Amino acid sequence: TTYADFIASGRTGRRNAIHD
Amino acid sequence: SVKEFLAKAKEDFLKKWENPAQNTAHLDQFERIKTLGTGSFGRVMLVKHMETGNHYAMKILDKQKVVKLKQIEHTLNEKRILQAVNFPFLVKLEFSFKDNSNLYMVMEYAPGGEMFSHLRRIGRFSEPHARFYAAQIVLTFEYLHSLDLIYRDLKPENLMIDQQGYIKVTDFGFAKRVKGRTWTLCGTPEYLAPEIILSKGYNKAVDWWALGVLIYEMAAGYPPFFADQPIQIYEKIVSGKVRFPSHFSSDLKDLLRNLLQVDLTKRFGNLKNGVNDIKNHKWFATTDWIAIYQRKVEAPFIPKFKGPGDTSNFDDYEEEEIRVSINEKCGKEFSEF
Ligand SMILES: O=C(c1ccc(Br)s1)[C@H]1CNC[C@@H]1c1ccc2c(=O)[nH]cnc2c1
């Protein structure tokens, strides 16, 4: 599932901003 | 009337914009309690104003780190804008000051924590729950855009929940007052509009794209474009393709198709009728925009606050001693702060 793929991904934590 | 309200709001904003408040407190007027959040060049701490006993959220920015990361102008923007604005869903900037090492912005404390924390924990919000939050963002962007401000960092990490369960937008680090178009590549990968990525100049319409990403993430529990690396995210964003969960309503999907619209002449919020295309969309049919603004709608949930300085709705962070050098750093760069 898409949910499963998200949770297994490395970007479920706080996301850093870019600038660059 | 609306026009009368926004005209007065611009008058108020322009006075403060042209004559910003400066040096309105000192570090020794606050007791530092606990870190509430962190960033590449600073942190936000819960503090108590020892005189009044009021609690605030004090952003502490290391001046040398700001310079090193080339965020001087962005930081000056943040403070100049935030001290000038006034809206129920914007965090208030109560005081600002600087010393030899750091910049300080003392903001209203939001004891409910970040939307991000609640969203991740429960998984996803119901559509009515998401709609309630979305409506507050629509009004906030209407207000900001009328002042020629672009926000440029919408995401759940930047949306605080107050004691009443309503939103307070914070993190004005990338906010900018611009009448034409701008070019800085900044924001968060998942939330970048295609025009930012394709490096062709952009305007306030990127905020409405970001609103689409936020509504999707709130309702789905994950964002419309994600991958392991930013490069893969960017490829999905520009593709013009979005997949919706099967539980999304027809109205929600139609709204998102019009917000997550790659073409600027077709994106909601950027058409002739402006924000009204969003406000009048079927997905918002049940939204009483006036009651939202007046905070008369019961929130999907209220955070229990067992004290004025309770931080149970925040994660725990590595604490660090606030070091202040006996020598002034980066004086010229931050002169107007
Ligand atoms: O810690 C934070 C930082 C931002 C930049 C630095 Br390089 S560090 C912010 C980030 N996302 C919300 C977080 C934050 C946390 C709590 C509050 C609060 O209670 N009131 C006002 N603003 C807040 C901001």
mmCIF file of C-alpha atoms and ligand atoms in Angstrom:
data_model
loop_
_atom_site.group_PDB
_atom_site.id
_atom_site.type_symbol
_atom_site.label_atom_id
_atom_site.label_comp_id
_atom_site.label_asym_id
_atom_site.label_seq_id
_atom_site.Cartn_x
_atom_site.Cartn_y
_atom_site.Cartn_z
ATOM 1 C CA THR A 1 0.000 0.000 0.000
ATOM 2 C CA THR A 2 0.989 3.657 -0.396
ATOM 3 C CA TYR A 3 0.661 4.166 3.349
ATOM 4 C CA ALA A 4 2.995 1.195 3.918
ATOM 5 C CA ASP A 5 5.511 2.604 1.441
ATOM 6 C CA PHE A 6 5.449 5.992 3.146
ATOM 7 C CA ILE A 7 5.990 4.575 6.638
ATOM 8 C CA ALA A 8 8.881 2.460 5.398
ATOM 9 C CA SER A 9 10.430 5.574 3.808
ATOM 10 C CA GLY A 10 13.003 7.861 5.350
ATOM 11 C CA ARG A 11 10.837 10.987 5.242
ATOM 12 C CA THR A 12 8.121 10.433 7.872
ATOM 13 C CA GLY A 13 10.072 12.505 10.405
ATOM 14 C CA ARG A 14 10.418 16.285 10.518
ATOM 15 C CA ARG A 15 11.458 17.572 7.124
ATOM 16 C CA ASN A 16 14.290 20.023 6.771
ATOM 17 C CA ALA A 17 13.871 23.059 4.574
ATOM 18 C CA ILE A 18 16.190 23.672 1.637
ATOM 19 C CA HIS A 19 17.535 27.054 0.545
ATOM 20 C CA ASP A 20 20.696 26.336 -1.501
ATOM 21 C CA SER B 1 -16.872 45.239 4.714
ATOM 22 C CA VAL B 2 -14.068 42.891 3.593
ATOM 23 C CA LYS B 3 -12.439 45.574 1.454
ATOM 24 C CA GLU B 4 -12.611 47.993 4.392
ATOM 25 C CA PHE B 5 -11.078 45.418 6.707
ATOM 26 C CA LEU B 6 -8.133 44.589 4.442
ATOM 27 C CA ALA B 7 -7.495 48.261 3.674
ATOM 28 C CA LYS B 8 -7.135 49.000 7.393
ATOM 29 C CA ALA B 9 -5.032 45.864 7.819
ATOM 30 C CA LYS B 10 -2.641 47.135 5.128
ATOM 31 C CA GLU B 11 -2.463 50.558 6.754
ATOM 32 C CA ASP B 12 -1.546 48.986 10.105
ATOM 33 C CA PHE B 13 0.979 46.672 8.438
ATOM 34 C CA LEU B 14 2.734 49.340 6.380
ATOM 35 C CA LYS B 15 3.335 51.600 9.382
ATOM 36 C CA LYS B 16 5.153 48.826 11.265
ATOM 37 C CA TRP B 17 6.847 47.606 8.059
ATOM 38 C CA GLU B 18 8.327 51.056 7.471
ATOM 39 C CA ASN B 19 9.164 51.588 11.177
ATOM 40 C CA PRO B 20 9.929 48.157 12.675
ATOM 41 C CA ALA B 21 10.003 47.574 16.418
ATOM 42 C CA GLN B 22 13.526 46.911 17.640
ATOM 43 C CA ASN B 23 15.232 45.988 20.924
ATOM 44 C CA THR B 24 12.083 45.569 23.003
ATOM 45 C CA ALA B 25 13.473 43.179 25.635
ATOM 46 C CA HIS B 26 16.623 41.608 27.097
ATOM 47 C CA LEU B 27 17.653 37.971 27.588
ATOM 48 C CA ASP B 28 17.846 38.339 31.362
ATOM 49 C CA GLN B 29 14.112 39.132 31.498
ATOM 50 C CA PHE B 30 13.331 35.453 30.766
ATOM 51 C CA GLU B 31 13.966 32.093 32.415
ATOM 52 C CA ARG B 32 14.683 29.353 29.852
ATOM 53 C CA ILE B 33 12.674 26.207 30.568
ATOM 54 C CA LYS B 34 12.925 23.701 27.709
ATOM 55 C CA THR B 35 13.625 23.353 23.980
ATOM 56 C CA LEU B 36 10.437 23.113 21.859
ATOM 57 C CA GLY B 37 12.087 22.718 18.464
ATOM 58 C CA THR B 38 15.369 23.061 16.550
ATOM 59 C CA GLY B 39 16.810 24.124 13.220
ATOM 60 C CA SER B 40 20.089 24.374 11.340
ATOM 61 C CA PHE B 41 21.042 27.724 12.914
ATOM 62 C CA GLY B 42 18.939 27.944 16.080
ATOM 63 C CA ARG B 43 16.232 26.648 18.378
ATOM 64 C CA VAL B 44 12.941 27.611 20.021
ATOM 65 C CA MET B 45 12.707 27.441 23.798
ATOM 66 C CA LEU B 46 9.796 27.697 26.176
ATOM 67 C CA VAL B 47 10.608 30.678 28.416
ATOM 68 C CA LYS B 48 8.903 32.480 31.273
ATOM 69 C CA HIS B 49 8.793 36.265 31.480
ATOM 70 C CA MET B 50 9.865 36.570 35.125
ATOM 71 C CA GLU B 51 8.058 39.878 35.643
ATOM 72 C CA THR B 52 4.569 38.878 34.451
ATOM 73 C CA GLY B 53 5.041 35.121 34.734
ATOM 74 C CA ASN B 54 3.792 34.808 31.161
ATOM 75 C CA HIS B 55 5.172 31.936 29.079
ATOM 76 C CA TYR B 56 6.540 32.486 25.555
ATOM 77 C CA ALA B 57 8.357 30.631 22.771
ATOM 78 C CA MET B 58 11.760 32.245 22.223
ATOM 79 C CA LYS B 59 13.556 31.570 18.966
ATOM 80 C CA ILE B 60 17.301 31.772 19.446
ATOM 81 C CA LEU B 61 19.361 32.180 16.275
ATOM 82 C CA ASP B 62 23.150 31.877 16.235
ATOM 83 C CA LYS B 63 24.330 34.853 14.142
ATOM 84 C CA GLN B 64 27.487 33.130 12.877
ATOM 85 C CA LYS B 65 25.463 30.118 11.706
ATOM 86 C CA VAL B 66 22.982 32.345 9.885
ATOM 87 C CA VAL B 67 25.841 34.029 8.003
ATOM 88 C CA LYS B 68 27.530 30.714 7.250
ATOM 89 C CA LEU B 69 24.278 29.351 5.806
ATOM 90 C CA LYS B 70 23.620 32.522 3.801
ATOM 91 C CA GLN B 71 20.297 33.227 5.537
ATOM 92 C CA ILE B 72 20.936 36.827 6.562
ATOM 93 C CA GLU B 73 18.369 38.444 4.288
ATOM 94 C CA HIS B 74 15.828 35.703 4.986
ATOM 95 C CA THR B 75 16.233 36.262 8.733
ATOM 96 C CA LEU B 76 15.837 40.032 8.390
ATOM 97 C CA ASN B 77 12.721 39.355 6.303
ATOM 98 C CA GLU B 78 11.317 37.027 8.967
ATOM 99 C CA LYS B 79 11.628 39.512 11.812
ATOM 100 C CA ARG B 80 10.562 42.610 9.866
ATOM 101 C CA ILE B 81 7.468 40.869 8.528
ATOM 102 C CA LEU B 82 6.440 39.084 11.711
ATOM 103 C CA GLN B 83 6.610 42.248 13.852
ATOM 104 C CA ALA B 84 4.357 43.992 11.301
ATOM 105 C CA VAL B 85 1.504 41.458 10.896
ATOM 106 C CA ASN B 86 -1.661 40.886 12.929
ATOM 107 C CA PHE B 87 -4.099 38.025 12.236
ATOM 108 C CA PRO B 88 -5.843 35.492 14.491
ATOM 109 C CA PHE B 89 -4.071 32.528 12.925
ATOM 110 C CA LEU B 90 -0.560 34.022 12.931
ATOM 111 C CA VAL B 91 1.732 33.560 15.891
ATOM 112 C CA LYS B 92 2.342 36.924 17.550
ATOM 113 C CA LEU B 93 5.859 38.343 17.846
ATOM 114 C CA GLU B 94 5.882 39.779 21.356
ATOM 115 C CA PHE B 95 9.497 40.985 21.660
ATOM 116 C CA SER B 96 12.747 40.894 19.687
ATOM 117 C CA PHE B 97 16.360 41.686 20.588
ATOM 118 C CA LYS B 98 19.930 40.624 19.934
ATOM 119 C CA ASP B 99 23.194 40.307 21.830
ATOM 120 C CA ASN B 100 26.817 39.603 20.923
ATOM 121 C CA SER B 101 26.150 36.071 19.629
ATOM 122 C CA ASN B 102 22.426 35.603 18.992
ATOM 123 C CA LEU B 103 19.199 36.966 17.549
ATOM 124 C CA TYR B 104 16.066 36.588 19.664
ATOM 125 C CA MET B 105 12.420 36.461 18.679
ATOM 126 C CA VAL B 106 10.022 35.984 21.573
ATOM 127 C CA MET B 107 6.781 34.621 20.199
ATOM 128 C CA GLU B 108 3.422 33.549 21.506
ATOM 129 C CA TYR B 109 3.599 30.027 22.938
ATOM 130 C CA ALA B 110 1.227 27.444 21.438
ATOM 131 C CA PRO B 111 0.786 24.707 24.051
ATOM 132 C CA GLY B 112 -0.965 22.310 21.644
ATOM 133 C CA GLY B 113 2.276 21.550 19.823
ATOM 134 C CA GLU B 114 2.781 21.047 16.094
ATOM 135 C CA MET B 115 0.093 19.708 13.760
ATOM 136 C CA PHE B 116 2.817 17.352 12.470
ATOM 137 C CA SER B 117 2.960 15.538 15.828
ATOM 138 C CA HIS B 118 -0.787 14.913 15.987
ATOM 139 C CA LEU B 119 -1.105 14.002 12.298
ATOM 140 C CA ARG B 120 1.679 11.433 12.409
ATOM 141 C CA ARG B 121 0.382 9.914 15.637
ATOM 142 C CA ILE B 122 -3.232 9.412 14.621
ATOM 143 C CA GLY B 123 -2.332 8.659 10.980
ATOM 144 C CA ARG B 124 -4.678 10.930 9.024
ATOM 145 C CA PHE B 125 -7.394 13.520 9.756
ATOM 146 C CA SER B 126 -11.017 13.094 8.664
ATOM 147 C CA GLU B 127 -12.113 15.414 5.862
ATOM 148 C CA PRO B 128 -14.090 17.637 8.264
ATOM 149 C CA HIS B 129 -11.037 17.827 10.555
ATOM 150 C CA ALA B 130 -8.742 18.669 7.627
ATOM 151 C CA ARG B 131 -11.251 21.169 6.236
ATOM 152 C CA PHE B 132 -11.371 23.026 9.560
ATOM 153 C CA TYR B 133 -7.600 23.560 9.465
ATOM 154 C CA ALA B 134 -7.551 24.246 5.709
ATOM 155 C CA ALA B 135 -10.118 27.047 6.099
ATOM 156 C CA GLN B 136 -7.858 28.842 8.564
ATOM 157 C CA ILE B 137 -4.946 28.616 6.132
ATOM 158 C CA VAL B 138 -7.081 29.952 3.279
ATOM 159 C CA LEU B 139 -7.973 33.054 5.332
ATOM 160 C CA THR B 140 -4.371 33.476 6.498
ATOM 161 C CA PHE B 141 -3.044 33.395 2.914
ATOM 162 C CA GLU B 142 -5.787 35.840 1.835
ATOM 163 C CA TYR B 143 -4.538 38.203 4.558
ATOM 164 C CA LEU B 144 -0.808 37.728 3.826
ATOM 165 C CA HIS B 145 -1.169 37.956 0.057
ATOM 166 C CA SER B 146 -3.074 41.219 0.386
ATOM 167 C CA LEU B 147 0.062 42.636 2.014
ATOM 168 C CA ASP B 148 2.192 41.360 -0.920
ATOM 169 C CA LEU B 149 3.657 38.678 1.336
ATOM 170 C CA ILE B 150 4.484 35.149 0.185
ATOM 171 C CA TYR B 151 4.860 32.601 2.999
ATOM 172 C CA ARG B 152 6.746 29.810 1.196
ATOM 173 C CA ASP B 153 7.042 27.213 3.960
ATOM 174 C CA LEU B 154 3.648 25.685 4.567
ATOM 175 C CA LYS B 155 3.751 22.233 6.196
ATOM 176 C CA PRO B 156 2.407 20.545 9.350
ATOM 177 C CA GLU B 157 5.752 21.137 11.126
ATOM 178 C CA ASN B 158 5.064 24.867 10.860
ATOM 179 C CA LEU B 159 1.463 24.861 12.068
ATOM 180 C CA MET B 160 0.945 25.212 15.812
ATOM 181 C CA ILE B 161 -2.224 24.231 17.654
ATOM 182 C CA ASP B 162 -3.366 26.680 20.332
ATOM 183 C CA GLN B 163 -5.317 26.054 23.549
ATOM 184 C CA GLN B 164 -8.619 26.406 21.626
ATOM 185 C CA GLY B 165 -7.624 23.819 18.995
ATOM 186 C CA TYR B 166 -7.160 26.518 16.352
ATOM 187 C CA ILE B 167 -4.069 26.980 14.196
ATOM 188 C CA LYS B 168 -1.258 29.444 14.622
ATOM 189 C CA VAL B 169 1.133 29.720 11.688
ATOM 190 C CA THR B 170 4.769 30.212 12.657
ATOM 191 C CA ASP B 171 8.201 29.910 11.009
ATOM 192 C CA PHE B 172 8.351 33.029 8.798
ATOM 193 C CA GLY B 173 11.967 32.254 7.838
ATOM 194 C CA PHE B 174 11.231 32.244 4.104
ATOM 195 C CA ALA B 175 8.481 34.846 4.126
ATOM 196 C CA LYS B 176 9.086 37.686 1.697
ATOM 197 C CA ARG B 177 7.395 40.895 0.642
ATOM 198 C CA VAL B 178 7.405 40.939 -3.140
ATOM 199 C CA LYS B 179 5.111 42.582 -5.681
ATOM 200 C CA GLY B 180 6.433 40.999 -8.871
ATOM 201 C CA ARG B 181 8.105 37.607 -8.999
ATOM 202 C CA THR B 182 10.982 35.976 -7.144
ATOM 203 C CA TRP B 183 13.487 33.151 -7.757
ATOM 204 C CA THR B 184 14.903 31.723 -4.520
ATOM 205 C CA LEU B 185 14.890 27.953 -4.324
ATOM 206 C CA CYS B 186 13.633 27.513 -0.788
ATOM 207 C CA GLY B 187 10.951 25.611 1.060
ATOM 208 C CA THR B 188 10.500 21.921 1.786
ATOM 209 C CA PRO B 189 10.830 19.392 -1.095
ATOM 210 C CA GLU B 190 7.425 17.726 -0.650
ATOM 211 C CA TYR B 191 5.742 21.176 -0.770
ATOM 212 C CA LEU B 192 7.549 22.885 -3.686
ATOM 213 C CA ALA B 193 5.404 24.078 -6.552
ATOM 214 C CA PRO B 194 6.595 22.983 -10.007
ATOM 215 C CA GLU B 195 7.573 26.548 -11.013
ATOM 216 C CA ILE B 196 10.056 26.774 -8.117
ATOM 217 C CA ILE B 197 11.705 23.510 -9.190
ATOM 218 C CA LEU B 198 11.848 24.516 -12.865
ATOM 219 C CA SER B 199 13.673 27.726 -11.888
ATOM 220 C CA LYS B 200 11.579 30.155 -13.963
ATOM 221 C CA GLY B 201 10.426 32.690 -11.376
ATOM 222 C CA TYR B 202 7.271 32.507 -9.302
ATOM 223 C CA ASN B 203 4.698 34.327 -7.190
ATOM 224 C CA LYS B 204 2.117 33.899 -4.391
ATOM 225 C CA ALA B 205 0.550 31.050 -6.414
ATOM 226 C CA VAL B 206 3.172 28.718 -4.904
ATOM 227 C CA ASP B 207 1.345 29.138 -1.560
ATOM 228 C CA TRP B 208 -1.892 27.814 -3.069
ATOM 229 C CA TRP B 209 -0.036 24.816 -4.488
ATOM 230 C CA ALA B 210 1.373 24.208 -0.997
ATOM 231 C CA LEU B 211 -2.179 24.396 0.399
ATOM 232 C CA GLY B 212 -3.047 21.520 -1.933
ATOM 233 C CA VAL B 213 -0.124 19.483 -0.640
ATOM 234 C CA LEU B 214 -1.140 20.206 2.950
ATOM 235 C CA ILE B 215 -4.800 19.253 2.473
ATOM 236 C CA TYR B 216 -3.729 16.042 0.736
ATOM 237 C CA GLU B 217 -1.285 15.160 3.542
ATOM 238 C CA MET B 218 -3.826 15.929 6.252
ATOM 239 C CA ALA B 219 -6.524 13.776 4.623
ATOM 240 C CA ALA B 220 -4.272 10.929 3.411
ATOM 241 C CA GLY B 221 -1.684 10.745 6.179
ATOM 242 C CA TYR B 222 1.089 11.051 3.604
ATOM 243 C CA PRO B 223 1.947 13.697 1.034
ATOM 244 C CA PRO B 224 1.028 13.466 -2.675
ATOM 245 C CA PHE B 225 4.685 13.333 -3.757
ATOM 246 C CA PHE B 226 7.188 11.392 -1.630
ATOM 247 C CA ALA B 227 10.273 9.257 -2.148
ATOM 248 C CA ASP B 228 13.594 8.523 -0.416
ATOM 249 C CA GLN B 229 15.507 11.381 -2.074
ATOM 250 C CA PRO B 230 14.413 14.955 -2.994
ATOM 251 C CA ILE B 231 15.359 14.445 -6.659
ATOM 252 C CA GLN B 232 12.745 11.698 -6.955
ATOM 253 C CA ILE B 233 10.197 13.950 -5.246
ATOM 254 C CA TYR B 234 10.810 16.749 -7.768
ATOM 255 C CA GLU B 235 10.255 14.399 -10.701
ATOM 256 C CA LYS B 236 6.837 13.447 -9.367
ATOM 257 C CA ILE B 237 5.861 17.064 -8.674
ATOM 258 C CA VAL B 238 6.484 18.267 -12.237
ATOM 259 C CA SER B 239 4.892 15.164 -13.830
ATOM 260 C CA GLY B 240 1.373 16.590 -13.564
ATOM 261 C CA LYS B 241 0.134 13.312 -12.083
ATOM 262 C CA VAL B 242 -1.379 12.768 -8.653
ATOM 263 C CA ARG B 243 -2.866 9.609 -7.193
ATOM 264 C CA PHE B 244 -5.651 9.852 -4.618
ATOM 265 C CA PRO B 245 -6.536 7.382 -1.829
ATOM 266 C CA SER B 246 -9.762 5.520 -2.515
ATOM 267 C CA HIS B 247 -11.356 7.099 0.574
ATOM 268 C CA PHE B 248 -10.989 10.676 -0.757
ATOM 269 C CA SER B 249 -14.385 12.214 -1.566
ATOM 270 C CA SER B 250 -15.167 13.380 -5.093
ATOM 271 C CA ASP B 251 -15.269 16.995 -3.919
ATOM 272 C CA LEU B 252 -11.832 16.679 -2.223
ATOM 273 C CA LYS B 253 -10.263 15.203 -5.344
ATOM 274 C CA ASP B 254 -11.719 17.959 -7.541
ATOM 275 C CA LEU B 255 -10.369 20.662 -5.212
ATOM 276 C CA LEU B 256 -6.929 19.099 -5.083
ATOM 277 C CA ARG B 257 -6.800 18.737 -8.862
ATOM 278 C CA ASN B 258 -7.327 22.484 -9.050
ATOM 279 C CA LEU B 259 -4.725 23.344 -6.365
ATOM 280 C CA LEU B 260 -2.132 20.797 -7.461
ATOM 281 C CA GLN B 261 -2.361 22.307 -10.943
ATOM 282 C CA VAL B 262 1.024 22.619 -12.675
ATOM 283 C CA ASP B 263 -0.240 25.390 -14.983
ATOM 284 C CA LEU B 264 -0.467 28.825 -13.337
ATOM 285 C CA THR B 265 -3.264 30.167 -15.518
ATOM 286 C CA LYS B 266 -5.425 27.316 -14.236
ATOM 287 C CA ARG B 267 -4.447 26.989 -10.574
ATOM 288 C CA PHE B 268 -7.075 27.922 -7.989
ATOM 289 C CA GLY B 269 -6.141 31.014 -6.015
ATOM 290 C CA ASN B 270 -4.452 32.437 -9.106
ATOM 291 C CA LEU B 271 -7.499 33.022 -11.331
ATOM 292 C CA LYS B 272 -9.674 36.110 -11.888
ATOM 293 C CA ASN B 273 -11.886 35.337 -8.889
ATOM 294 C CA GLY B 274 -8.840 34.750 -6.693
ATOM 295 C CA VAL B 275 -9.335 33.072 -3.326
ATOM 296 C CA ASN B 276 -13.089 32.918 -3.950
ATOM 297 C CA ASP B 277 -12.634 29.964 -6.354
ATOM 298 C CA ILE B 278 -11.292 28.102 -3.320
ATOM 299 C CA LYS B 279 -13.808 29.406 -0.784
ATOM 300 C CA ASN B 280 -16.752 28.655 -3.096
ATOM 301 C CA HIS B 281 -15.635 25.138 -3.982
ATOM 302 C CA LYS B 282 -18.064 22.338 -3.088
ATOM 303 C CA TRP B 283 -15.579 20.785 -0.638
ATOM 304 C CA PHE B 284 -15.932 23.963 1.483
ATOM 305 C CA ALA B 285 -19.735 24.168 1.099
ATOM 306 C CA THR B 286 -20.266 23.516 4.834
ATOM 307 C CA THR B 287 -17.608 26.050 5.901
ATOM 308 C CA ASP B 288 -18.846 29.171 7.655
ATOM 309 C CA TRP B 289 -15.889 31.401 6.860
ATOM 310 C CA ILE B 290 -17.009 34.144 9.242
ATOM 311 C CA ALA B 291 -17.432 31.735 12.164
ATOM 312 C CA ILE B 292 -13.973 30.263 11.444
ATOM 313 C CA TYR B 293 -12.410 33.733 11.554
ATOM 314 C CA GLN B 294 -14.274 34.576 14.770
ATOM 315 C CA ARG B 295 -13.149 31.240 16.296
ATOM 316 C CA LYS B 296 -16.796 30.301 17.005
ATOM 317 C CA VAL B 297 -16.550 26.852 15.396
ATOM 318 C CA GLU B 298 -15.832 23.988 17.815
ATOM 319 C CA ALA B 299 -12.432 22.513 17.005
ATOM 320 C CA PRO B 300 -12.025 18.823 16.008
ATOM 321 C CA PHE B 301 -10.038 18.535 19.245
ATOM 322 C CA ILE B 302 -8.589 20.608 22.086
ATOM 323 C CA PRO B 303 -5.199 19.848 23.643
ATOM 324 C CA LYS B 304 -5.523 19.334 27.396
ATOM 325 C CA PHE B 305 -3.243 21.920 29.021
ATOM 326 C CA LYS B 306 -2.507 20.883 32.607
ATOM 327 C CA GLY B 307 -0.522 24.061 33.238
ATOM 328 C CA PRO B 308 0.686 27.261 31.561
ATOM 329 C CA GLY B 309 4.118 25.688 31.066
ATOM 330 C CA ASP B 310 3.096 22.137 30.176
ATOM 331 C CA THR B 311 5.061 20.801 27.166
ATOM 332 C CA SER B 312 3.522 17.317 26.936
ATOM 333 C CA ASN B 313 2.434 18.040 23.330
ATOM 334 C CA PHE B 314 6.072 18.563 22.275
ATOM 335 C CA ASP B 315 8.892 16.104 21.609
ATOM 336 C CA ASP B 316 12.010 16.152 23.750
ATOM 337 C CA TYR B 317 15.189 17.706 22.327
ATOM 338 C CA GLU B 318 18.877 17.699 23.229
ATOM 339 C CA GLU B 319 19.407 20.761 25.420
ATOM 340 C CA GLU B 320 22.421 23.047 25.047
ATOM 341 C CA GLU B 321 23.794 25.966 27.058
ATOM 342 C CA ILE B 322 23.012 29.362 25.534
ATOM 343 C CA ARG B 323 26.523 30.727 24.944
ATOM 344 C CA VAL B 324 26.994 34.495 24.640
ATOM 345 C CA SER B 325 30.393 35.727 23.481
ATOM 346 C CA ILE B 326 32.118 38.689 25.096
ATOM 347 C CA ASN B 327 32.705 39.912 21.529
ATOM 348 C CA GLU B 328 29.990 41.156 19.177
ATOM 349 C CA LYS B 329 29.607 38.939 16.100
ATOM 350 C CA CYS B 330 28.224 39.914 12.689
ATOM 351 C CA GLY B 331 27.251 43.393 13.845
ATOM 352 C CA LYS B 332 26.926 45.044 10.443
ATOM 353 C CA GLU B 333 24.907 42.211 8.904
ATOM 354 C CA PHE B 334 22.200 42.342 11.553
ATOM 355 C CA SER B 335 22.185 46.065 12.225
ATOM 356 C CA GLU B 336 18.478 46.553 11.437
ATOM 357 C CA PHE B 337 17.387 43.563 13.487
HETATM 358 O O1 LIG C 1 11.497 25.174 16.675
HETATM 359 C C1 LIG C 1 11.285 25.732 15.615
HETATM 360 C C2 LIG C 1 12.355 26.420 14.889
HETATM 361 C C3 LIG C 1 12.278 27.176 13.755
HETATM 362 C C4 LIG C 1 13.523 27.638 13.291
HETATM 363 C C5 LIG C 1 14.536 27.243 14.081
HETATM 364 BR BR1 LIG C 1 17.109 27.349 12.132
HETATM 365 S S1 LIG C 1 14.015 26.274 15.417
HETATM 366 C C6 LIG C 1 9.900 25.751 14.987
HETATM 367 C C7 LIG C 1 9.866 24.920 13.690
HETATM 368 N N1 LIG C 1 8.503 24.390 13.519
HETATM 369 C C8 LIG C 1 7.748 24.794 14.688
HETATM 370 C C9 LIG C 1 8.762 25.097 15.826
HETATM 371 C C10 LIG C 1 8.172 25.956 16.925
HETATM 372 C C11 LIG C 1 7.786 25.379 18.130
HETATM 373 C C12 LIG C 1 6.964 26.054 19.015
HETATM 374 C C13 LIG C 1 6.542 27.349 18.725
HETATM 375 C C14 LIG C 1 5.634 28.087 19.622
HETATM 376 O O2 LIG C 1 5.154 27.610 20.649
HETATM 377 N N2 LIG C 1 5.346 29.395 19.226
HETATM 378 C C15 LIG C 1 5.871 29.944 18.105
HETATM 379 N N3 LIG C 1 6.675 29.309 17.248
HETATM 380 C C16 LIG C 1 7.002 27.982 17.562
HETATM 381 C C17 LIG C 1 7.821 27.282 16.670
#
